[PDB]
Write an enzyme that holds these catalytic residues in place. Structure first.
Site, PDB file in Angstrom:
ATOM      1  N   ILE A 176     -94.705  88.716  38.052  1.00  0.00           N
ATOM      2  CA  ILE A 176     -93.335  89.226  38.178  1.00  0.00           C
ATOM      3  C   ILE A 176     -92.236  88.257  37.733  1.00  0.00           C
ATOM      4  O   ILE A 176     -91.089  88.678  37.557  1.00  0.00           O
ATOM      5  CB  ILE A 176     -93.064  89.863  39.572  1.00  0.00           C
ATOM      6  CG1 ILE A 176     -93.438  88.893  40.728  1.00  0.00           C
ATOM      7  CG2 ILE A 176     -93.779  91.216  39.691  1.00  0.00           C
ATOM      8  CD1 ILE A 176     -92.911  89.258  42.127  1.00  0.00           C
ATOM      9  N   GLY A 177     -92.589  86.989  37.548  1.00  0.00           N
ATOM     10  CA  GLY A 177     -91.642  85.965  37.125  1.00  0.00           C
ATOM     11  C   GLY A 177     -92.252  84.632  36.750  1.00  0.00           C
ATOM     12  O   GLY A 177     -93.412  84.349  37.068  1.00  0.00           O
ATOM     13  N   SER A 178     -91.449  83.803  36.067  1.00  0.00           N
ATOM     14  CA  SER A 178     -91.812  82.458  35.623  1.00  0.00           C
ATOM     15  C   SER A 178     -90.590  81.536  35.747  1.00  0.00           C
ATOM     16  O   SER A 178     -89.465  81.960  35.468  1.00  0.00           O
ATOM     17  CB  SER A 178     -92.322  82.493  34.185  1.00  0.00           C
ATOM     18  OG  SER A 178     -93.007  81.299  33.841  1.00  0.00           O
ATOM     19  N   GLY A 179     -90.827  80.303  36.194  1.00  0.00           N
ATOM     20  CA  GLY A 179     -89.800  79.284  36.388  1.00  0.00           C
ATOM     21  C   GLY A 179     -90.310  77.885  36.114  1.00  0.00           C
ATOM     22  O   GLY A 179     -90.153  76.982  36.938  1.00  0.00           O
ATOM     23  N   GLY A 200     -93.269  77.046  37.889  1.00  0.00           N
ATOM     24  CA  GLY A 200     -93.230  77.997  38.992  1.00  0.00           C
ATOM     25  C   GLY A 200     -93.438  79.431  38.550  1.00  0.00           C
ATOM     26  O   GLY A 200     -92.479  80.123  38.207  1.00  0.00           O
ATOM     27  N   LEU A 201     -94.699  79.882  38.571  1.00  0.00           N
ATOM     28  CA  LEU A 201     -95.141  81.228  38.195  1.00  0.00           C
ATOM     29  C   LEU A 201     -95.156  82.119  39.459  1.00  0.00           C
ATOM     30  O   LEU A 201     -95.634  81.666  40.501  1.00  0.00           O
ATOM     31  CB  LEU A 201     -96.556  81.085  37.596  1.00  0.00           C
ATOM     32  CG  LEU A 201     -97.208  82.279  36.912  1.00  0.00           C
ATOM     33  CD1 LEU A 201     -96.688  82.452  35.494  1.00  0.00           C
ATOM     34  CD2 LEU A 201     -98.718  82.096  36.863  1.00  0.00           C
ATOM     35  N   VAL A 202     -94.600  83.357  39.388  1.00  0.00           N
ATOM     36  CA  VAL A 202     -94.550  84.277  40.544  1.00  0.00           C
ATOM     37  C   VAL A 202     -95.318  85.587  40.291  1.00  0.00           C
ATOM     38  O   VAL A 202     -95.100  86.243  39.270  1.00  0.00           O
ATOM     39  CB  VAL A 202     -93.113  84.517  41.113  1.00  0.00           C
ATOM     40  CG1 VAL A 202     -93.141  85.402  42.363  1.00  0.00           C
ATOM     41  CG2 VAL A 202     -92.409  83.199  41.426  1.00  0.00           C
ATOM     42  N   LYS A 219     -96.045  82.363  44.773  1.00  0.00           N
ATOM     43  CA  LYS A 219     -95.436  81.380  43.879  1.00  0.00           C
ATOM     44  C   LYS A 219     -96.388  80.204  43.632  1.00  0.00           C
ATOM     45  O   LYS A 219     -96.511  79.321  44.482  1.00  0.00           O
ATOM     46  CB  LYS A 219     -94.073  80.910  44.429  1.00  0.00           C
ATOM     47  CG  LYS A 219     -93.254  80.084  43.441  1.00  0.00           C
ATOM     48  CD  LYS A 219     -91.969  79.569  44.064  1.00  0.00           C
ATOM     49  CE  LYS A 219     -91.174  78.731  43.093  1.00  0.00           C
ATOM     50  NZ  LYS A 219     -89.987  78.115  43.742  1.00  0.00           N
ATOM     51  N   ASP A 263     -79.185  73.417  44.922  1.00  0.00           N
ATOM     52  CA  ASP A 263     -79.359  74.282  43.750  1.00  0.00           C
ATOM     53  C   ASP A 263     -78.971  75.746  44.026  1.00  0.00           C
ATOM     54  O   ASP A 263     -79.691  76.671  43.638  1.00  0.00           O
ATOM     55  CB  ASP A 263     -80.793  74.145  43.181  1.00  0.00           C
ATOM     56  CG  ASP A 263     -80.995  74.670  41.766  1.00  0.00           C
ATOM     57  OD1 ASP A 263     -80.005  74.720  41.000  1.00  0.00           O
ATOM     58  OD2 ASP A 263     -82.145  75.025  41.425  1.00  0.00           O
TER      59      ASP A 263
HETATM   60  C1  LIG Z   1     -87.078  94.023  40.459  1.00  0.00           C
HETATM   61  C2  LIG Z   1     -88.439  94.225  39.784  1.00  0.00           C
HETATM   62  C3  LIG Z   1     -89.593  93.874  40.730  1.00  0.00           C
HETATM   63  O1  LIG Z   1     -89.505  94.722  41.881  1.00  0.00           O
HETATM   64  C4  LIG Z   1     -90.919  94.141  40.011  1.00  0.00           C
HETATM   65  C5  LIG Z   1     -92.108  94.087  40.974  1.00  0.00           C
HETATM   66  C6  LIG Z   1     -89.512  92.382  41.129  1.00  0.00           C
HETATM   67  C7  LIG Z   1     -89.308  91.399  40.152  1.00  0.00           C
HETATM   68  C8  LIG Z   1     -89.228  90.050  40.509  1.00  0.00           C
HETATM   69  C9  LIG Z   1     -89.370  89.680  41.850  1.00  0.00           C
HETATM   70  C10 LIG Z   1     -89.373  88.461  42.515  1.00  0.00           C
HETATM   71  C11 LIG Z   1     -89.082  87.264  41.868  1.00  0.00           C
HETATM   72  C12 LIG Z   1     -90.029  86.640  41.057  1.00  0.00           C
HETATM   73  C13 LIG Z   1     -89.708  85.452  40.397  1.00  0.00           C
HETATM   74  C14 LIG Z   1     -88.432  84.903  40.520  1.00  0.00           C
HETATM   75  O2  LIG Z   1     -88.121  83.750  39.866  1.00  0.00           O
HETATM   76  C15 LIG Z   1     -88.261  82.632  40.746  1.00  0.00           C
HETATM   77  C16 LIG Z   1     -87.475  85.542  41.309  1.00  0.00           C
HETATM   78  C17 LIG Z   1     -87.793  86.733  41.960  1.00  0.00           C
HETATM   79  C18 LIG Z   1     -89.505  88.724  43.885  1.00  0.00           C
HETATM   80  C19 LIG Z   1     -89.596  87.845  44.979  1.00  0.00           C
HETATM   81  N1  LIG Z   1     -89.706  88.243  46.248  1.00  0.00           N
HETATM   82  N2  LIG Z   1     -89.797  87.283  47.021  1.00  0.00           N
HETATM   83  C20 LIG Z   1     -89.801  86.122  46.362  1.00  0.00           C
HETATM   84  C21 LIG Z   1     -89.893  84.793  46.596  1.00  0.00           C
HETATM   85  C22 LIG Z   1     -89.837  83.984  45.528  1.00  0.00           C
HETATM   86  S1  LIG Z   1     -89.674  84.983  44.179  1.00  0.00           S
HETATM   87  C23 LIG Z   1     -89.691  86.455  45.008  1.00  0.00           C
HETATM   88  N3  LIG Z   1     -89.659  90.046  44.007  1.00  0.00           N
HETATM   89  C24 LIG Z   1     -89.580  90.652  42.825  1.00  0.00           C
HETATM   90  C25 LIG Z   1     -89.639  92.001  42.469  1.00  0.00           C
END
Ligand SMILES: CCC(O)(CC)c1ccc2c(-c3ccc(OC)cc3)c(-c3n[nH]c4ccsc34)[nH]c2c1
EC number: 2.7.10.2
Length: 240
Positions: free
Chosen positions: A15-18, A19-21, A35, A122
């Site tokens: 769902i994300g990359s920074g 630290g992979l999520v 994370k 930050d």
């Molecule tokens: C809006 C689209 C969707 O619903 C797709 C499943 C979604 C997308 C990204 C996230 C994240 C998240 C993932 C990585 C991030 O960069 C650090 C920031 C937030 C998070 C998130 N939820 N809780 C936390 C904790 C650290 S990152 C993160 N939830 C997400 C949900």
């Protein structure tokens, strides 16, 4: 310190990359934001700090998964992801009252951290999360770009709650402009030179005269002239 076995985690989607999520499940039940991994010791310590700070506007952890590398932190899943992305994707659909409420959520979490003598270092929209009913929670608050840094931070590394107040002012600007990049296409040396001369981020369309005054209060040259998060919270609530 809340150790989770790797077999208890199910990785569903990145769902994300920074630290992979990754979006996942813990014990095939709870939706979690995993994370994956900076040194290993500092990564654990950041979670240990966060696990002892309980506020409705601060992100929570289910635990930490060590033993097997790469090590990971098991966070609660936030439905609408990071605030920076949420503002950009939902641009043009936000009301002025909704944007102020987002700032109030961050300020509540920050007022709690301020009283606990915890400096974020930050604070930015990219380090905030969006949950159910657009609830904003401050994330990555357990750590020990210059565009969010106060003059005493970018010049002398003088971190305090008043330096977080400056960062909150930039966060307030990010929210009211609906995810715009602060000082866009400008280098680190360019932003330092501009702020030193007295330059401040422009007033966005959705931000009223009173909201922009609060932003400029956060952007005072001297940290002592900036209002504390405890004061900022009531000032923002009065505008609503
Ligand atoms: C809006 C689209 C969707 O619903 C797709 C499943 C979604 C997308 C990204 C996230 C994240 C998240 C993932 C990585 C991030 O960069 C650090 C920031 C937030 C998070 C998130 N939820 N809780 C936390 C904790 C650290 S990152 C993160 N939830 C997400 C949900």
């Amino acid at each position: 310190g809340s150790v989770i076995d790797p077999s208890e985690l199910t990785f569903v989607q990145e769902i994300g990359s920074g630290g992979l999520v990754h979006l996942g499940y813990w014990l095939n039940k709870d939706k979690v934001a995993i994370k994956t991994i900076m040194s290993e010791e500092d990564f654990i310590e950041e979670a240990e700090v966060m696990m002892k700070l309980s506020h409705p506007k601060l992100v929570q952890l289910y635990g930490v998964c060590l033993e097997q590398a790469p090590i990971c932190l098991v966070f609660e899943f936030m439905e609408h992801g990071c605030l920076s992305d949420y503002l950009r994707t939902q641009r043009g659909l936000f009301a002025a009252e909704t944007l102020l409420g987002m700032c109030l959520d961050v300020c509540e979490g920050m007022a709690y951290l301020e009283e606990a003598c915890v400096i974020h270092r930050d604070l930015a929209a990219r380090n905030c999360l969006v949950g159910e009913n657009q609830v904003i929670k401050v994330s990555d608050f357990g750590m020990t770009p210059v565009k969010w840094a106060s003059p005493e931070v970018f010049s002398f590394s003088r971190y305090s709650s008043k330096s977080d107040v400056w960062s909150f002012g930039v966060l307030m600007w990010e929210v009211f402009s609906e995810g715009k990049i602060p000082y866009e296409n400008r280098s680190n040396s360019e932003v330092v030179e501009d702020i030193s001369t007295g330059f401040r981020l422009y007033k966005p369309r959705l931000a009223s005269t009173h909201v922009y005054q609060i932003m400029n209060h956060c952007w005072k040259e001297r940290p002592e002239d900036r209002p504390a998060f405890s004061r900022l919270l009531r000032q923002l609530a009065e505008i609503a």
